[PDB]
Structures are given as structure tokens and as C-alpha cells.
């Protein structure tokens, strides 16, 4: 299992030290605010209201919390992930990732909190 | 496990199949948006802005989703729990509960919704 | 989850600080050399040779772990139980007992190291 | 998970879907009645009374349950494994195999029931 923090100015993602395997079961909780770039700031599902300007992740909103897995494309977190199995046979590292735009994350504030650990299989 | 919705409309809360017994480990996660009167809507965690006026929770925002155990009083759970385990004493079914102050859910709107497993222990 | 041993010759039982409730998945693995009264030993699914002359469990040979559940009949347990539920009704504390005739405990000799845990559910 | 059996008489053991990878936690139970060559039979411990006379794993008796993580040594099974963990650097699929000397396994009988489970980690 693995805890630990995702700044929201991290435009590089916190590698975990979660190895995804085939097969594996996953439980994901996150907690906490971030913003990118307002003062005002969101939980781990981001800013609903906001448009998408060309973020990592098309599918969550701006300033939610996305992953990767191995060389997959981004995958939306949001809250949490319950007794999951990664679609399409992905495999590999699981690195957590604030959902901004490249190249403007250098004015983002905060973090998330991000439990991951392994279910029953 | 259980899987349903929380609507902010209910001052009663949802009912779950879920009996907390002790030294029972749970994960919960939770999702969605909800509002206690304003046009905007928040997530779990609710609005980190707001006065406390009388909420049901007093550990947790306004419009944060909290839970009871049985006849306990409330315990937040916002975003979710990652393999919680209660203080001793509390035992019965789990009730989840928008946060708000009573008397005054008739302007509430929107709903959370959540799963509820047992872990290993 | 509890760890302990399950002395041959304790008519009593062991009893264990697992309480079954309603739901519960439980698995149980059993290790260790006992005797009923010869002089060899057996493992835990004990002597398939030997005619039952009053067991306190008749589905399981003379020299087997067993268990009851709270106020439970004897139930068997053998090698072990593999994410188990049990049947509806019964729930309570779990004691684990050597397998032989009442009032025949006294030259019994060795034991049973037991591991129970919870799954999830 | 994997469900299935163990004939004593396969020298080459039983290849199964279980890939322990580094981190996994497993459950192995097992069950049943096999020998050696005698017309008596043992449950996965084996039979405690007889020598070693060349068997592929030195650290159970003749007629136990025992396993390969990929390319390991044995290590004994037994009547199984709760909650457990691989020394370092081992890892790969889960060989099942019944404990005798090589060369020895045609006059084999009967066979173990095997569950494996990955636990919550
Ligand atoms: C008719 C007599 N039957 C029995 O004795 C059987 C076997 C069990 N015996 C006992 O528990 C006791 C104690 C005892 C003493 N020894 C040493 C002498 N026996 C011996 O060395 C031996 C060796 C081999 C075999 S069978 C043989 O085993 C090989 C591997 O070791 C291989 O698998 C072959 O394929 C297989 O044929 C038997 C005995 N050992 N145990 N004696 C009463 C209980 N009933
Ligand atoms: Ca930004
Ligand atoms: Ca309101
Ligand atoms: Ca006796
Ligand atoms: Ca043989």
C-alpha cells in the first residue's frame, strides 16, 4: 500500500511505489484542496465549472486527480477508485498527476492526499 | 458490499446494508456534487468557506458528507475512509448524511454517491 | 485476525478473539502433529482409519480441528477454510477443539497452531 | 485466484495462474488424501515418520505439498499459507508440487485440493 502527497504544481506527476499487475484489484482514496491557479480551491474532482483549455486529461475536470499506469494514457482518479481493474490490460508504475495544462502549472497551489493499496483477487 | 446515492435534500440519510461490527475494517468512496442552498455545488469534502451555523457535523464542512454507526453521533467521512477502523465502542448499521443545519434541507439539492465494502482483518 | 494454538487435550476448546457476525468471510489455515491416545500423530484432518465411537463432531475423523461458532454445533475445519461463509444463523465468539469423545481428552497430546482472518465482503 | 488439485504422481508439479509479484500477500489452503506408495495415505503434511531418502524439498516430509515461485527452490506448503510474503527477489508463477524423491512418482496416489488467493496489500 501507499500513502503520500500530490502537489498540484507537480507538472511531472508523483511517481508511487505501486507496481500495477495484471490481474490487480485497486482502492484509491484522495483527499484534500488544490488549485490551478485561482484562490479559491477544489477537492480531488476539480473545478466543474471550468472549461478545458487543453488539459492532460480530457476526461475529468481541471484540477481533479488523474494517474498513469506504465506508459498508459491519463486515467481520471477524481475521489477514488473502488476495487478497480485497470481497462485494456494496462500494466506498470501508477504515477498521480494534478489535471492542468501543460506548461501552466507553475502557478498552482496544494495538494491531495492519496492512499492506493491492493484488494483481493 | 453497497453501492447508492446520498441525497443533500435528506435530513434522515440513506440507509446502507452495511453493520458496522467490532474491529471491522471499511473503505468507503464518494463522489458527486451537491449544494446546501447556493447555485454552486461542491464535492464531498463540502465548502471549506462556510461558517459552521449549527451543522449536524461539527468536524466536517458544510454540505461534506458524514456518516453515523448505529446510535453513534456523526463521524465525517468526506472524500471517503481508507481501511478505517472506528473508535471503540460503536456497532449498527451505517447511516450516511449530507452536513448541514437541521431544519434548513429544503433548499439543498444534488446527491453523493458512495461505496461501501469490508476489508481484510 | 488471531493466531494461536489449539492444545489436543483441552476439551474446552480454545476459544479466539474472533466473533463471527452475519456476512462475514472468514479463512482459517491449520498446521501441527496431535494424537487422540496412540503413540503417532496426525495433522489436522486426523485419523481416516479410525471408527468413530462418539466424536463431538461426526463429519469430520477422530483427531480433526473443529470449531463451533458462539452456541454452535460442532462444524469442521480440517486443513482449513477457504474464504468460507457460514451457514445462516449461526454467529458468536469462535472456539476451536480437538476432535475426540467427550471425557477421553486426558491422554491426548500435541497441538494445532491456527490462523483465522476476516476477507473482505 | 486459482482453485484446483495436485496429483501426487506428477513429478513436474501443477502450473498455476498465480503470479507473485513483488509486494503480493497469498493464501494457500489445501486438503486431501495422497501417498507415496504405501496403500495408507497422508493429508499435505506428509508422513512424519519417514526418511528422507532424496526428496526435492529436504524441509518437509515425503508426501507434503510444496511450491516453486518462478525459478526457486521448494518451499513447503503444507497444509498452506496465511496472509504470506516471498523472501526478496523471488517471484513468478506458483508450481504446486507433491514432496517425494525424483524418479519415484509412478507408484503415486490420490491427490491434494488447492485454493490460492492474493490478500489485501
Ligand atoms: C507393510 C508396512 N507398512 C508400513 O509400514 C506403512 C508405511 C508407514 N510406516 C511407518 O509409519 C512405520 C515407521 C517407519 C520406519 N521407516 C523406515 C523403514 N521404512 C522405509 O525405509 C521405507 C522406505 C520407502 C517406503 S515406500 C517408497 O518411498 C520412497 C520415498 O522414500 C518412494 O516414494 C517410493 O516410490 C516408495 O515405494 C516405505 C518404507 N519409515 N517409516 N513403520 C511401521 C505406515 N504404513
Ligand atoms: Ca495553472
Ligand atoms: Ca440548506
Ligand atoms: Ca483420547
Ligand atoms: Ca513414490
Redesign the interface.
Known sequence: ?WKGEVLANNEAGQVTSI?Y???DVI?????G?ASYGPTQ?????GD??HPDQGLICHDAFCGALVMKIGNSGTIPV??????WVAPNNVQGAITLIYNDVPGTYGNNSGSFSV?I?????
Open positions: 500500500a507496481i499487475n495484471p490481474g482502492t484509491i482514496v484522495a483527499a484542496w480551491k477544489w477537492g480531488p474532482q466543474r465549472e477524481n475521489t477514488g477508485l473502488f476495487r492512499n493499496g491492493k484488494d483481493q483477487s
